[PDB]
A paper describes a structure:
The first complete archaeal Ub modifier system, including E2 and E3 enzymes, was discovered in 2011 in Candidatus Caldiarchaeum subterraneum. C. subterraneum Ub (CsUb), E1, E2, and E3 are organized in a single operon, adjacent to a second E3 protein and a JAMM protease (CsRpn11) with high sequence similarity to eukaryotic Rpn119. We have shown that CsRpn11 is highly active on its own, cleaving both CsUb precursors and, at a later stage of the ubiquitination cascade, CsUb-conjugated substrate proteins. Our bioinformatic, structural, and biochemical results reveal unique features of the archaeal proteins, but also remarkable conceptual similarities with their eukaryotic counterparts.
In an attempt to obtain full occupancy, we soaked CsRpn11Δ149–202–CsUb crystals with ZnCl2 and indeed obtained the structure of a completely Zn2+-bound complex. Unexpectedly though, this structure now represents a later step in the catalytic cycle: In addition to Zn2+, a new catalytic water molecule is bound. It is found in the same place as in the unliganded CsRpn11 structure, but in the complex it displaces the CsUb C terminus into the second coordination sphere of the metal, which can be regarded as the initiation of CsUb release. The structure of a completely Zn2+-bound CsRpn11Δ149–202–CsUb complex depicts the next step in the catalytic cycle, where a newly bound catalytic water molecule displaces the CsUb C terminus to initiate substrate release.
Author numbering:
A (entry chain A): -3 to 122, 126 to 148
B (entry chain C): -11 to 78
The structure:
């Protein structure tokens, strides 16, 4: 179906995404997911961000954030790298819009197992949890929500 | 000596390109200072099986235009570039 079978997110990394989203209910926010693949399992070890511009319906992360992050990771002894991106959908529910899909296709072209995490901070799933999904474009071009733990 | 062996040794500047997403091997390309950033990015996109219209090269903290020459940037043997792609939600 899809290049990544499932996603494992370190709880503090998820917490950082959630807190960043919850700190800006008036605009979409974005950042990068850092981690590594282990077979078909994608591990999200951390989440980082930087300079950006956003509105309720849109966000762009400055491209030099990715550049600086990749170079630091590349230099370091750690075998971690950018594995995806996150952004928020405040009050909009969780999905990939056409623009999001275009961004995500470009991530996957560079790294087949890349993922897009989308969080809506104003909502709670269902027992309760945070309202997020981790998406990937499947081999036949469809948005799929991956199993997350 | 094959006539195309000359072409193999054109230049003696080797640069490193780090793909920004994924853990993929950096590319190490032999280039000339007269080469454009665009020619480098084209080669990198071909090696990584990327289309040509989705990435950009960055160098010492700046995103580069494809029309810039490596010579104009003061590129040296061993220097590194990062290949980035956009991060936009919409
Ligand atoms: Zn979105």
């Amino acid at each position: 179906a899809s290049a990544t079978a499932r996603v494992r997110i370190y709880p503090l990394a998820l917490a950082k995404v959630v807190k960043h989203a919850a700190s800006s209910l008036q605009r979409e926010v974005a950042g990068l997911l850092v981690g590594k693949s282990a077979g078909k399992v994608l591990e999200i070890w951390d989440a980082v961000t930087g300079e950006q511009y956003g509105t309720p319906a849109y966000v762009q992360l400055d491209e030099m954030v990715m550049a600086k992050v990749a170079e630091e990771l590349s230099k370091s002894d750690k075998n971690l790298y950018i594995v995806g991106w996150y952004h928020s959908h405040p009050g909009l529910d969780v999905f990939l819009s056409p623009t999001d899909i275009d961004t995500q296709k470009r991530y996957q072209a560079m790294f087949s197992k890349a993922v897009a995490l989308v969080v809506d901070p104003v909502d709670y799933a269902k027992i309760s949890s945070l309202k997020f999904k981790v998406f990937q474009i499947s081999k036949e071009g469809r948005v799929v929500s991956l199993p997350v733990s | 000596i094959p006539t195309t062996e000359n072409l193999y040794f054109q230049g003696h500047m080797k640069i490193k390109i780090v793909p920004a997403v994924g853990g993929g091997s950096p590319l190490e390309l032999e280039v000339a200072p007269n080469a454009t950033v665009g020619a480098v990015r084209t080669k990198v996109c071909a090696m990584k099986k990327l289309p040509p219209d989705t990435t950009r090269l960055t160098y010492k903290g700046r995103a580069l235009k494809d029309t810039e020459t490596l010579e104009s940037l003061g590129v040296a043997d061993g220097d590194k570039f990062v290949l980035i792609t956009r991060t936009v939600g919409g």
